[PDB]
Amino acid sequence: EQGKGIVEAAIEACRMRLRPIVMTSLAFILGVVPLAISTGAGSGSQHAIG
Amino acid sequence: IGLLVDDAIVVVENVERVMAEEGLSPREAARKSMGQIQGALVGIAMVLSAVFLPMAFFGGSTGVIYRQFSITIVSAMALSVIVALILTPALCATMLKPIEKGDHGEHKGGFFGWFNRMFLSTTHGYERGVASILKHRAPYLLIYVVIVAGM
Numbered sequence: 001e002q003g004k005g006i007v008e009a010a011i012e013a014c015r016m017r018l019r020p021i022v023m024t025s026l027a028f029i030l031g032v033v034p035l036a037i038s039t040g041a042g043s044g045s046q047h048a049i050g
Numbered sequence: 051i052g053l054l055v056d057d058a059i060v061v062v063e064n065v066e067r068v069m070a071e072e073g074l075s076p077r078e079a080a081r082k083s084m085g086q087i088q089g090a091l092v093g094i095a096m097v098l099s100a101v102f103l104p105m106a107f108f109g110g111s112t113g114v115i116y117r118q119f120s121i122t123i124v125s126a127m128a129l130s131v132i133v134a135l136i137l138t139p140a141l142c143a144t145m146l147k148p149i150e151k152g153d154h155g156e157h158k159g160g161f162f163g164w165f166n167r168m169f170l171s172t173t174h175g176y177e178r179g180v181a182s183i184l185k186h187r188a189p190y191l192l193i194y195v196v197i198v199a200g201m
Contacts (some may be wrong), residue, residue: 007184011177018173020063027059028052 053098054126057091061134065142076147080139088135095131099124 004012035043036050061084068074068083084091106113106120155163183190 011180011184014180015173015177016067018176019169020060023059023063024056027055031052031055 053123054130057130057134058138061087061091061138062142065139069148077143080143084135084139091131091134095127098127 032050035046038046064083064087065079068079069076074082102120102123106117108116153163155166157163
């Protein structure tokens, strides 16, 4: 809505926003791998979501 | 906790982005950046609460299971947008006033300034990647239909 069109805008948008996607991706993966690897009490229900 | 630390990291990158691309004042950086992010961040609340609200409407024995799941999510995500709109715009402007001099990841302290350059090479390859997606645009849309046959 300022100075660009359609095809050119979506390229610079993902060029701007590639860093927060890989920011949240590695954090969300490494936060939920412990309940996907761990064994013990209730782990059979943790492995159904992790 | 995963979606609760998602929005704790999507809001500091947007305020350091204007410090990196423009060198703007770190007090007014929050008003410059989050003037167009406050709408998006309050709009993700009513979709991230709507993906959990009707599942807590069921009855029987599965209703007691499905409630206290979705309630424990919506209580986390309902106030996290409020604290993301109130607290961290002040805290990025008060307990963070960085002014970097000289280096841009070249020296960086030690030799670990190659990782951000590798990140720059991957996004420089990624813009060419999405340009090659937008080259013909027919096979990358026709592979979507053979994906949803999996569904």
